[PDB]
């Protein structure tokens, strides 16, 4: 018995939410893990914005030289038929104008609703008090009625590996 599973590396933030890395970063981590289970992933080799980021596989923690934080990381897995298995990413635009990916469980839920031709999706049952409007491509706070923009891109697919039995 062999099954396929999508590899999504994730780091725990200050709100106790597991945040995903990008698919480019996750491929680089898995290549270091294949060669050395106790190695260090130097994300500065990938892009200049990731210079202060180091992921230590020896202790499974993220090290940031620009802030000093030590935050746990995990090697999580999702279903190949979900958005990370293809490369589909849903992102929302923060106050600084930067695009930020939703949590992976929410990203997969948004993509499932979009292809089911749902005009909108309510995330309240999943903890987020937000409404996703695909017609205006926006996210609305249920309490304040204020909105942010969101977009869909076909980025890189996250790595896929084999789980035995
Ligand atoms: N999808 C999201 N995921 C994580 N954080 C978010 C998301 N949307 C907004 N935030 C954060 O919540 C804060 C503002 O929430 P928002 O609902 O936009 O404000 P308001 O309460 O004024 O409507 C910001 O710090 C923003 O970074």
Numbering used by the authors: 20 to 184
Give the authors' words.
We solved two crystal structures of DTX1 in complex with ADP, with each structure having one ADP molecule bound to either of the two WWE domains. Our efforts to obtain a DTX1 co-crystal structure with both WWE domains bound to ADP were unsuccessful despite having excess ADP in our crystallization setups. To gain insight into why ADP ligands were only observed in one WWE domain in our DTX1-ADP structures, we investigated conformational differences by comparing the bound and unbound WWE domains in the same structure. While the core structural elements appear to be conserved, some loop shifts are observed in both structures, with most differences occurring when ADP is bound to the WWE2 domain as compared to the unbound WWE1 domain in the DTX1-WWE2-ADP structure. The observed differences are in the loops that interact with the phosphate groups and may reduce the surface area of the ligand-binding site in the unbound WWE1 domain of the DTX1-WWE2-ADP structure, which therefore might discourage binding in the second site. Comparing our DTX1-WWE1-ADP and DTX1-WWE2-ADP co-crystal structures with the RNF146-iso-ADPr structure revealed that the residues at the corresponding distal ribose-phosphate moeities binding sites in DTX1 WWE domains may not support high affinity binding to iso-ADPr. Specifically, neither Trp30 nor Trp111 would allow for a direct hydrogen bond to the distal ribose oxygen, while residues in the loop regions (30–38 in WWE1 and 111–122 in WWE2) would not contribute to high affinity binding to the distal phosphate group. Our biophysical data, however, supports DTX1 preference for iso-ADPr over ADPr, which may indicate a mechanism where it recognizes PAR via both iso-ADPr and ADP moieties.
